[PDB]
Each structure stands twice: as structure tokens, then as C-alpha cells.
């Protein structure tokens, strides 16, 4: 029973950051040596755990979170970070125990495109590992908006341009966040 890591990383298309996909992984043997020792990753930052010793540990559950963001915003996927994405789209807890993996995807997700979205307006910051997919019109004034965009009424979602002619910071970056769970329940995700 091989853990479906390839489904997450090698997916044909990714989800937008505001509706980031999460893959629950359980009851399988995990071979991370296929994942690391493979290069092609521009950023592989691990917190609290070592990917080197990941092949001989047992975890209750493993989560793989997939989304596409700009290169400038990759730094926001880190504990204690702040920004549009860290506050309104995807938040990591300060005690995050996992790895953040990103790589440039200008070849795949950039069209001379306009399909990846991010949340631009929100009244409060996101709690860690919280998913918000609301498309309700953001009310910036005392006047109710009645679901129609206008003055003091903005659509909370904005779309990345993702043009191949943009700079490296503007280029799309597929990001996969690995979160490891160690509940008291019998461990189901181990390695060789």
C-alpha cells in the first residue's frame, strides 16, 4: 500500500490558494525518498521534523496541502509570517511541524492563467489550517451590499495574472505543505 504522494505533487492542475486542497493520507507505507533526493524544488523548508529520518517514523496521519501562489508570497508559507496570503488564504501555526515544498510552475500554470484566485478582503485573519471559500461580496461600509458589487462592496477574490513574460516573483509557484499528525490512535503511516 503505497502512499499517494504522486497524486498531490504531480497533479495536472492545482487548486487556488483560497480553496487549497488537502489530501488525507492514512494506512499506507510512505516512501519519501521518491519525494526528496529528486531536486526540481526551489524551496524545501522543514520545521520541527527532518525529512532525512522520515522513512523510519510512524505518524497517525499525514496531510498534503496543495495551492498555487506567486513567488514573492512563498515566504509567507512559514510560521509567524504575515501578509495577504498568510492572513486571508493559508495560515501556518507558529508551532508548525512539517515541511513546505515549492517549485516554479511558469511552464504549466501561466497562460498568455486567470484561473488561480486569492482572497483579497477579509475582516479578520485566518486561524491556522483554516479554509475559507466564501464568495460573498465584502462589505466595506455600513450600507449592506445585497450581493452586488459596487461602492464599498468588493468581490473578495482576486485573480493572478500569471503571464509568462512577468518576472520570477510574479511567476506561479506550486506549493505543497506536508503536515504530520501523531494522535494517540494506532499509527497508520510508517516507512521502510
Amino acid at each position, epitope marked *: 500500500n503505497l502512499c499517494p504522494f504522486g497524486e498531490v505533487f504531480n497533479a495536472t492542475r492545482f487548486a487556488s490558494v483560497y480553496a487549497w486542497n488537502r489530501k488525507r493520507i492514512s494506512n499506507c507505507v510512505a516512501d519519501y525518498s521518491v519525494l*526528496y*533526493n529528486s*531536486a526540481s*524544488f*526551489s*524551496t*524545501f*523548508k*522543514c*520545521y*520541527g*521534523v*527532518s*525529512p*532525512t*529520518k522520515l522513512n523510519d517514523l510512524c505518524f497517525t496521519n499525514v496531510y498534503a496541502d496543495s495551492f498555487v501562489i506567486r513567488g514573492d508570497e*512563498v*515566504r509567507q508559507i512559514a510560521p509567524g509570517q504575515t501578509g495577504k496570503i498568510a492572513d486571508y488564504n493559508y495560515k501556518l501555526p507558529d*508551532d*508548525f*511541524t512539517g*515541511c513546505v515544498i515549492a517549485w516554479n510552475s511558469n511552464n504549466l500554470d501561466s497562460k498568455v492563467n486567470y484561473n488561480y484566485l486569492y482572497r483579497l478582503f477579509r475582516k479578520s485573519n485566518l486561524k491556522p489550517f483554516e479554509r475559507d471559500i466564501s464568495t460573498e461580496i465584502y462589505q466595506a461600509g455600513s450600507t449592506p451590499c445585497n450581493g452586488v458589487e459596487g461602492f464599498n462592496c468588493y468581490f473578495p477574490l482576486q485573480s493572478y495574472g500569471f503571464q509568462p513574460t512577468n518576472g520570477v516573483g510574479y511567476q506561479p509557484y506550486r506549493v505543497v505543505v506536508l503536515s504530520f499528525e*501523531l494522535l494517540h490512535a494506532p499509527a497508520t503511516v510508517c516507512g521502510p
Partner: antibody
Amino acid sequence: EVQLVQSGAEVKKPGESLKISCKGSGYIFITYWIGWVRQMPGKGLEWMGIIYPGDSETRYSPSFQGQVTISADKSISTAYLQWSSLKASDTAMYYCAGSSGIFTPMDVWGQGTTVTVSS
Amino acid sequence: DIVMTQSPDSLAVSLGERATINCKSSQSVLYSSNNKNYLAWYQQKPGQPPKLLIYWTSTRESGVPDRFSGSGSGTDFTLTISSLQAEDVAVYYCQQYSSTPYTFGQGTKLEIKR
């Protein structure tokens, strides 16, 4: 089997500027954070700071904040520890330690660099 | 800064006997709800760089002989060498990696009691 190779021994007069290097080799290296440890003659190990080569995120120990600069160059997979002005108090052996994450033990160690600052 | 204190400063253990080194933590060395103490043991032979022996207070680095054992919880930790050999003479340090200020122990000198 990742390895860290540091620069050669350095002998400098007080007030000079020094830049020592630490190059690592290994397939699993994008995950490896590079830190610096100072060991004064006859004394224990003192942790100076750490840097992630990918985004050059540097976290310094308060005892070494501003006293030294930690840099990186992901193109050549090397990390650097530079003093603006050397003082005789800096006579020590400096190791660079590699760890596959922040808040993880340092598995890979360099051979060490001996810095003797004297007039 | 989480101050790490070791005891004894120097230890003399005869060949083939058991060597015990203690490490006292000023604070907790827990990073999250893993309940795993983020504490490690390092061995430094004279003229040698430090070598990681035990991490997470219980797991040994690949290639470390079984005679090395680590235990403890909370603020008290202990490194145990079950059968001391001639190649175990070194200085042993305990280091925590819970908070960003990484702190090493004072160092324990281990010598063979002849």
C-alpha cells in the same frame, strides 16, 4: 551521506575583515539549514546563528546579533560567516553544522576552521 | 535562552562499565503537541568536530552502537553508555533545538578509569 567542507585556517591581525566559507555536497541539500557554532580554545560550543540557503532567511543568536553577518550563495551551495572588524576575542575554531530543518538536530558537521586573531 | 546544565563536569568510568551523564533544562524543550523532547546529544573527540549520537532523547543516529542510550523527560535528561570502550573517550554535549536560541551544555569530559 551529506558532507560539509569549510575553508582553511585563517590568521589575521586585529581590526581586519574575515570571510570564511562552508560548502556542502549532497542530493538532499535544499532541505538542509546551515548554522554556525563557535568553540573558544578549551571551552564548549556556542551557537551563533543559522541560515536557509534557499531564501537566505537568517536567524542570529542574541549573543551574536550584529556582531557577525551570516550569508549564503545557493548557486555554489556555500555559506559564509563574515566579521566586519576582527577582535582578539574572536580567536576560536568555527564549525558549520547542517540540519535538514529548523528545530531539528544538526547531523552534518564540517571539519572546522581555526581563526587566530593576534597582533 | 534555555540554559542547559550538565552533571558531572568530568566522569571517569572503567572499561566495559556504565557511564551516565545528566543534563538539566531550565525550561521545557517541547516544540509542539508531539510530546517529543527536542533534545540531542553530541560527542566530540579531541581534535574532532562534534558528532550527533542521540536525538529526540531516545533515537540514535544511524551507525551509533547500541551501548549508547538516551532517556529522560521534561527538564531532566540522561545519556547512558552501557559498556564503555576505548573509543568512547570524548566530551559529550546536550543541545536543545526547541527555541531559536540554540543552547549547548557545558560539556562533560569522559575518561577511562584505569
